[PDB]
Structure 1
């Protein structure tokens, strides 16, 4: 399993609802959902080390981490968390996040590489689940 690639989105489910429970206000939400129409996701994996960049017309976000080692990452709405990724299986990693300040929805994300070359991202905020599917460009 090598998650490396330039990935383009082919389906998305429930992203706007995710942002709502994350408390993003309606104005900022409409801006976000519209932009998320044509993102680019770039991943590079070397062993257990990862870099992930996701870009829309309004914003680019970049993160790097190593599976199994704590790191810091913001929630999708910009709140700081301590995160830790583990392999759930050979083709699926799961990130658990703990907010550093205040209280808020419990957040997580997972990334899975299917045998037919799709990348599936799931993002959770409390009970809301968002799913995005990408293929290589």
Structure 2
């Protein structure tokens, strides 16, 4: 995705309120397989799978328009994307604990993408997808064909 040349139409898209608010993880599916595919061993899988997750999306207190804040509170981790826009690429610390290049993008009007690109190894990327389904935020994570769907409800 790259539309730098003439981005007046895609200047800044404002997050649909469907993705906004605080969501607590209800359940997930095929998460272990995703972890294996992602290259996480048993130890990591013992962490990652047992990590409860709370999503927080809000208008960015940065004081600007269109921007949004998003943090990923878990049991063992914690990440806080201060002031980001969809289609925007910024540096920050992801769940993987490093401070690397990250990009968000509204790919469809019901699915946002979170892509983590490590400064050290940009090939060991990782992508989450924020889909809406019903009154739940449904995350889709796919690696090596392995899709895992994490079902988040509001708080």
Please give the range of the TM-score, normalised by the shorter of the 2 chains. 0.7 to 0.9
Structure 2: give runs of 5+ residues left out of the alignment.
1-15
Corresponding residue for 1:43?
57
Shift in alpha-carbon separation, 1:100–1:5, aligned structure 2, 3 A:
same
Q: TM-score, normalised by structure 1?
A: 0.75
Q: Distance in 2 between matches of 1:68 and 1:104?
A: 20
Query: Relative contact order (alpha carbons < 8 A, sep ≥ 6): 1 or 2 greater?
Result: 1
Which of 73, 76, 101 aligns to 1:82? It is 101
Number of residue pairs matched by the alignment: 134
Corresponding residue for 1:125?
143
Shift in alpha-carbon separation, 1:80–1:17, aligned structure 2, 3 A:
farther
Q: Higher strand fraction: Structure 1 or Structure 2? A: 1
Tell me which moved more, 49-58 or 2-11.
Answer: 49-58
Contact 1:106–1:125 (CA under 8 A) maintained in structure 2: no
RMSD: 2.6
Who wins on radius of gyration, i.e. which is larger?
2
Q: TM-score, normalised by structure 2?
A: 0.68
